[PDB]
Design a protein around this ligand. Sequence first.
Ligand SMILES: Nc1ncnc2c1ncn2[C@@H]1O[C@H](COP(=O)(O)OP(=O)(O)OP(=O)(O)O)[C@@H](O)[C@H]1O
Ligand SMILES: O=C(O)[C@H](CC(=O)N1C[C@H]2CCCC[C@H]2C1)Cc1ccccc1
Length: 1133
Amino acid sequence: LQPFVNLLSKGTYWWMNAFIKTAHKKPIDLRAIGKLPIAMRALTNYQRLCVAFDAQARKGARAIWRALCHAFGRRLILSSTFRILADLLGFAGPLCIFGIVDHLGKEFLGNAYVLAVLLFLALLLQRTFLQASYYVAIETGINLRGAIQTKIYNKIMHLSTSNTAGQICNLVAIDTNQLMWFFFLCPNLWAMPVQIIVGVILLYYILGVSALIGAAVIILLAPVQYFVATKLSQAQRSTLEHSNERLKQTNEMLRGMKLLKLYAWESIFCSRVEVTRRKEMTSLRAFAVYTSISIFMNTAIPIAAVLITFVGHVSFFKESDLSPSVAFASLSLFHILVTPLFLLSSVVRSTVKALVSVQKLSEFLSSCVQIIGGFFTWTPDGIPTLSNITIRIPRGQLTMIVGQVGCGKSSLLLATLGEMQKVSGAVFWGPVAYASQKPWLLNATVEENITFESPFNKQRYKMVIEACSLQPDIDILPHGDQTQIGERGINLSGGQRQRISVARALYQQTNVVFLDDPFSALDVHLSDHLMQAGILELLRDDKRTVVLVTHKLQYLPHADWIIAMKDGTIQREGTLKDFQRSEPWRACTKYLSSAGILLLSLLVFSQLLKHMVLVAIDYWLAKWTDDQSVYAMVFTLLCSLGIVLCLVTSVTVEWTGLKVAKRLHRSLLNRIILAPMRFFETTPLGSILNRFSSDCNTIDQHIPSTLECLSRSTLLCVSALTVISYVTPVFLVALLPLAVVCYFIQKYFRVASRDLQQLDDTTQLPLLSHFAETVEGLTTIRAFRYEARFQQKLLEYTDSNNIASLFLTAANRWLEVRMEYIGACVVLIAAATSISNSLHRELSAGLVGLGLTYALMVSNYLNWMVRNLADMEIQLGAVKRIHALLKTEAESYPDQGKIQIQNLSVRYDSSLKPVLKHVNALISPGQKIGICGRTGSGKSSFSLAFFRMVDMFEGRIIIDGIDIAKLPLHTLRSRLSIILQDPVLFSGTIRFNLDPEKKCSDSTLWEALEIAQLKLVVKALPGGLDAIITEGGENFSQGQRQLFCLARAFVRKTSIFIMDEATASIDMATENILQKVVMTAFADRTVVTIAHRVHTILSADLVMVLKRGAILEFDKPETLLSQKDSVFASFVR
Ligand SMILES: Nc1ncnc2c1ncn2[C@@H]1O[C@H](COP(=O)(O)OP(=O)(O)OP(=O)(O)O)[C@@H](O)[C@H]1O
Ligand SMILES: O=C(O)[C@H](CC(=O)N1C[C@H]2CCCC[C@H]2C1)Cc1ccccc1
């Protein structure tokens, strides 16, 4: 609430003080953050931008710039006016140091004390204009993002469906941010020229022509600073290529982990991910080189400029003798030109990226029922897709739209709606509940999807779910209801999704309903259930106009009207009779522990030795000004020794950063591979994967750079407070109060800012997610006429994004205003005490300048120390949670088919109910054993029990004379065939997905593919036995993929085969093909089949029934059918 408060509280952000103190105690919630001010709302900014657009266009890429300039120009020069005004008041430090030091070494301005309060007042007054300049630029930048995101969205509700779903979200998340961040750094575009030009002009007057030569070096090194920034960002992209390639290879490893650990291919796929990692680490060296140079230039160009400015002034020109006032006033000017001169690279880089974004943004912004005649074409001009489409469906009566495949069926429905440009014809036609041919699901609850922003009724909902008969399906789902169906509907199944969209159509209370192929993936049994109960007994009962378009003609007789489509034309439209007649410092220690004692010693000793040179340089200047070639000799040497150490301390932090980033990931990968199968099922995949994506990214690129920023600022602030204390020892008395105050300000910030950074991120996701939802189901939204209702949901989402981001900026300004006040209070104590000592005691004029030139800079170092420490705390969440995951568990480490089980006391998990108990069996070599039982009756345990994956087997299994327990895991899994229920084939060649051990012969591998009756399609692939297959994908069918897994099984030749519900998720013909292959090809080798199919184990040598723990296991299935009273298997079959 900055506008309401007065000028003083607004400048000092006193209104934020109570919020900070309150948030320190309890976490920030949406209730804690208030509603947005009227002036800064998404709707208000959007209306202002629309007014600007109307004004500009009333008389392209130029227009949007004019509208952005017109709407947000008044609150932008007001930001630039402060920035310029703060720049001029900035030179009241360097100029007043000139005044103070000169008077000591030699009209109220003639007094040294008077200038000590002018230095105090100007520094106090500058460091609020500068901060109020940052805020108003930010508050305009954030208010702009609110206006554009609404502007982008209001275009989405219009664009034709002929066209890029992911581009629009990218346009919101990246292209708008680059435009927003241009308005953060917009005033600098007019303030760098003013601040630098006055700066360089001042240096000439203070020091002479020699100040230009030193000033030219810094300016001339801005392009080289910029060039490194270009080479770095190129290197980051090339690293981003391998990281995305790595995450694909890792994701396939975690998802299909059970298949891998069954075949003992965990090491092979772990080896393949490391090969991609090493390439990423190679491309990450160049990112370290061009980050090392970037740190080297930013701390060795200021030193180089000082070296050439002073040495050149005394050696070449032989001008006026160097004096403490001139040398230290000029030195303090360099410290305040480098910050503008080194950010100018990022300002130009941002401006060239903002020019692209606007052009990219302006490219996006430019993109019953009776019909008379009618010609509709998806293209703006071309062959009309619908021709002679003249229809008149009745009101309140069901109508069927039936025709050939791909012949104007779904287009005609969209022709009735407004998504088809009319070449000609006349159409006259409220909101319509349209069940899309391709169903779309909101990223929300199953209850939310069906109600779809409509009031809930208990009776209505009960009938709908019973009619669609999707409730029994949700019963098997992991959650009873309110399941979070994310993007793409991965949680739900294809057939289940189709019902939901039809359920959404059937739930709504509207007169006209267009159900576009409700039975596309609906089973024939349920399809009649949905049609009879829902379409007829529910939809037709309510006197609701229903239009249905499906291939199943069985429901044609139960239809008032029916139309026939031919070649995209409505040939005839009549009734059935008419138609028939016509036709954490603990984590930081863990991070620095892995670097190595050698590097860690070199890292620490280089930092401490560098800042004993960067002070011994400045102290030597204070001794110099008071033989004159001798002083230049030592000062040149120290400047070179300062530069050399700036190179060493820039390589080491990056060299260390790679050494940890390499070891931490590699040590992480080898740990989860050895985790037992129980760990992967219990822990959600999202938890493990995000460690490899974000945390291994934060350590790769963010920690090493931040660790340098925090270590460089902390030592500078220690050096600044030591030099300023050696000059005036009385300053130590005031150091304790300013240490206690500076601690609490740091504490309340880190507590409050950490909350808002998390709150900022968690409100970003709903905003982007809403853009994806709108574009994916744009046709459905405009069918319900929920465009206005959906657009309103954006304003709430983006307002909760701005206010969460408008406190993160008011928190930073709160901190920087406090520290700059503390720093402006240190400069008074430093000035007051040194001048007291210099005039009365025997202090020198040079040491006075040395104290002041650090007092001015102790405000910045205090600010970087607390801001970097805030970021270093957050970025150490990467190491903290990796080290937690890194301590997971670790598993310990066939000639004849005789397998024996000793009581099989196997427990599905630690300290749980035993799945199977007291199960004794003995299968002779070369015998086909079958296992059948109820779902969850322990049959599924015996499948994984033979592979020691059940980690609590309190019994014994003897296979071919040995024990499956004593033998090591990677030597027992590798010699036992398995066929999981759901087939999976991982990315790689066919030769590298059927024998990754690279031991199979080329001729043999072809026979195995042919043995599975698969050689024809395999040979048909390009290359042959080397075609680059994709994970799942379309290169193979579901029957073929399950068929290929049989070929992979035949490759092992382990003489013991275990099949676990291979029949499921397969075709009936393929099951006969698979069963015939197993019966014929695998005649020997003791095939064991655990499945629910009746006919799978009918011909087996022996069949074992499974009760809660064990049931009758008749060796002869023929005897079992008679003995079981035709109940156990005969009745089930
Ligand atoms: N973005 C698009 N650009 C061009 N044509 C399009 C586009 N979207 C759809 N179409 C047209 O719509 C046709 C499919 O709809 P149509 O009603 O003609 O067939 P259908 O019988 O409903 O098909 P299906 O069984 O695939 O649902 C395509 O063949 C194409 O001519
Ligand atoms: O001190 C800072 O360096 C500023 C940090 C800050 O205030 N914010 C708030 C913004 C919210 C939206 C996204 C994050 C930014 C970061 C950034 C900045 C603003 C203006 C000028 C220079 C730097």
